[PDB]
């Protein structure tokens, strides 16, 4: 199981500067050496490289676009099978009720419980009711990952109104909740932990130097 | 000349997770894409890789330890020659009063003006008196890089007492001053820029995920 504490997301998609299984493995080692308790990573190859450099538990996803679906975080059994092969300890998937290319969310949850019974699952959700649906499906973890990143949560950011959305998720489910998405600073990390999340996933604030650089530059441009 | 704004230090020494000319070239790309106006980098190998990735001006150093000297930032003509070969726009060196392994600081300054007349020079100093000595030697930039990092500045950090050390440096010299050392947040970057530095160097806050991870973990340990 994931400990309490800091999960570092070590992702770099094609065309991002640090894109490379190798580099993500080194970002993960850096996170490990700074006191991270887990890693979140994207694609079987990045996960396998990371698992060569750290024994931290990994939350695995496959970001892959499908025609006629806005679901891209572990959309189908093809991505699930890649992640089972990766041996990541936790499989994260979009747990919205948006249209998927193939299996439904219920079918992907059954698929994972049948084919990878020792793997934990994590629901990336955007709304309280998606969170409650995930809790009902027996998700091990419910993350705020997609809050602000679906067509229907545009402009919503986890931290808004002192983490009201996070407070509402924590109030609505007994499952382990993960503060993920727009945890930008140590102060935000402390706040989500004090609000009672099991753990927090921090990505861009640690592993996206372009995004960190932009925050430094923006302070001069207000 | 270096513009006003943010210089990103893209360094990873041999024991650090990201040690690699290729990775530091990508950190530099990320800095560029985020709005940096320059790069500080270490070793000819890293500098050449960065200079083929971005056209941003580079402050080059070679960190290399010598016996019977505490000077490790561009200590001798050997490091200077590596930086001349690198074609970096600015050569930075330890510009402390500390005894060097070979040439004196004064000797090295003469050497650079002779052997690389088109290169600007940056004085990494620890004290106001070293800043004044650097102005004496005609340095183009005076950075606060070694303030707190010498045997005679123990316990001091750039930000202490609302950047009093930086205020004292800026009052002491007419040369372009660079805020470097422990500039860890956008707030600190804003502050040193508002105090009148030419530019600021931010390293670990952007390019050392281990260091950033430690600050996240640390807020849960206070
Ligand atoms: C919507 C989406 O794709 N999210 C990604 C999912 O893996 C990453 O953003 C991940 O959550 C990283 C943590 O977010 P941040 O960079 O700290 O804001
Ligand atoms: C004393 C020393 O070795 N300094 C290094 C000089 O290259 C780095 O610290 C460099 O100044 C980068 C700025 O420091 P930070 O990583 O932003 O805190
Ligand atoms: Cl980046
Ligand atoms: Cl690091």
Residue numbers in the entry:
A (entry chain AAA), B (entry chain BBB): 1 to 222
Sentences from the paper on this structure:
The third step in the sialic acid catabolic pathway is mediated by the enzyme N-acetylmannosamine-6-phosphate 2-epimerase (NanE), which catalyzes an inversion of stereochemistry at the C2 position of N-acetylmannosamine-6-phosphate (ManNAc-6P), yielding N-acetylglucosamine-6-phosphate (GlcNAc-6P). The crystal structure of NanE from Staphylococcus aureus, which comprises a triosephosphate isomerase barrel fold with an unusual dimeric architecture, was solved with both natural and modified substrates. Based on our structural and kinetic data, we propose that NanE performs its epimerization reaction using a novel proton displacement mechanism mediated by the substrate.
We aimed to examine the involvement of the C5 hydroxyl of ManNAc-6P in the catalytic mechanism. Two derivatives were synthesized with substitutions at the C5 hydroxyl: 5-deoxy-ManNAc-6P, with a substituted hydrogen, and 5-methyl-ManNAc-6P, with a substituted methoxy group. SaNanE was cocrystallized with these ligands to obtain ligand-bound structures. Unambiguous density for the N-acetyl and phosphate groups of the ligand was present in one of the monomers in the same position as in ManNAc-6P. The center of the ligand appears to bind in a different orientation to that of ManNAc-6P, notably with Glu180 interacting with the C4 hydroxyl of the substituted ligand. Mutagenesis studies identified the roles of Lys63 and Glu180, and crystallographic modeling highlighted the unusually short hydrogen bond between Glu180 and the substrate, which is retained even if the C5 hydroxyl of the substrate is removed (it now forms with the C4 hydroxyl).
